[PDB]
């Protein structure tokens, strides 16, 4: 699972460019200036309205999700497999990933490089009525990480907020699987 | 109609007037206004009442010591 020093340097140097991802997404969705401070009262008002109305909330979530997914793809492509200290023939994890015995390139990517963004349905993350994603975040915060963008990895651990978001996503997935476990056998019984 | 007695204002207090505001205070040692009969009671020296013609304690505890509580 480990990476080389240059691989970790690549990963960090690409992640540190994602500081303003959420801020730029908000600036574009609000039709404000491209370079707008995150504390602008106009920006806060626009974000308040966007939180209030579900359609604009979904639009902002889609835009920011697109940007952060692009960043995640960049990180994964740059790092794997040019950062792993053990290469494919001997790297057991990457070998059973590529060979398709188990797992997937997505699993390897989120283990070694980045979880990315936790998508709750088609939306980033539910927000409290005060525009505060978690009790640990500024109201109307323009950070992708605050919006559910997990900058950590399963190898080096995740911050508590990222753990909370990942728990939410896993809960959503488990709910969907439990609901669809026995969705309809009546269709098949009627047809037969 | 005595609730528990009528110790009325027979000892009238004279506060004559011909620039006036209420100045509510909490406890220092010295128009929903249906209490404006305290100063004008009768103006006729008679036992009757007649109609007329930062309090918040700051106690700040400010300036959190970031240098002390923000330990690396």
């Amino acid at each position: 699972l480990r990476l080389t020093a240059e691989g970790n340097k690549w990963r960090t140097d690409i992640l540190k460019t994602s500081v303003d991802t959420g801020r730029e997404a908000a600036a574009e969705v609000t039709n404000l200036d491209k370079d707008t401070p995150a504390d602008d009262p106009e920006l806060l008002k626009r974000l308040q309205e966007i939180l209030r109305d579900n359609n604009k909330s979904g639009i902002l979530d889609a835009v920011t999700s697109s940007k952060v997914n692009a960043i995640t793809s960049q990180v994964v492509s740059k790092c794997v497999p040019d950062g792993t200290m053990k290469k494919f023939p001997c790297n057991s994890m990457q070998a059973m990933a590529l060979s398709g015995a188990k797992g997937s390139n997505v699993n390897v990517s989120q283990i070694m490089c980045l979880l990315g963004q936790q998508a709750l349905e088609g939306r980033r993350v539910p927000v409290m009525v005060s525009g505060k994603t978690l009790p640990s975040f500024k109201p109307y915060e323009t950070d992708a990480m605050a919006g559910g963008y997990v900058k950590g990895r399963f190898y080096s651990g995740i911050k508590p907020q990222e753990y909370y978001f990942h728990c939410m996503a896993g809960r959503e997935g488990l709910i969907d699987t439990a609901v669809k476990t026995s969705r309809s056998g009546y269709l098949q019984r009627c047809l037969t | 109609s005595i609730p528990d007695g009528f110790k009325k204002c027979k000892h009238l207090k004279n506060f004559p007037l011909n620039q006036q505001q209420v100045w509510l205070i909490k406890f220092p040692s010295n128009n929903l206004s249906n209490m404006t009969l305290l100063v004008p009671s009768e103006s006729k020296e008679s036992l009757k009442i007649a109609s007329t013609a930062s309090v918040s304690e700051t106690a700040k505890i400010p300036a959190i010591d970031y240098s002390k509580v923000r330990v690396p």
């Binding site: - | 109609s1 005595i2 609730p3 528990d4 007695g5 009528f6 110790k7 009325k8 204002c9 207090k13 506060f15 007037l17 620039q19 006036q20 505001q21 209420v22 100045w23 509510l24 205070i25 909490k26 406890f27 010295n30 128009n31 249906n34 209490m35 404006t36 009969l37 305290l38 100063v39 009671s41 036992l47 009757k48 009442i49 007649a50 109609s51």
Partner: protein
């Protein structure tokens, strides 16, 4: 100098001070257990000459009643 002791109509009310608290009376109408320290309202009559200040601190047709019990 400190001393201690929508609607309009001609003078009809009065003061009782059962002990402050009254009940009041008149021929037209028929007229506090909180704010222990907020009760200290005073009336300002400041004279703006230089610095001078002053300080100082219905049933007419409502009696209808139905039967006690309705069978």
């Amino acid at each position: 100098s400190v001393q201690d002791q929508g609607f309009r109509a001609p003078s009809d009310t009065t003061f009782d001070l059962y002990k402050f608290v009254l009940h009041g009376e008149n021929e037209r109408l028929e007229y506090d257990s909180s704010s222990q320290a907020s009760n200290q309202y005073v009336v300002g009559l400041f004279n703006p000459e230089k610095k001078s200040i002053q300080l100082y601190k219905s049933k007419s047709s409502k009696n209808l009643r139905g039967p006690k019990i309705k069978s």
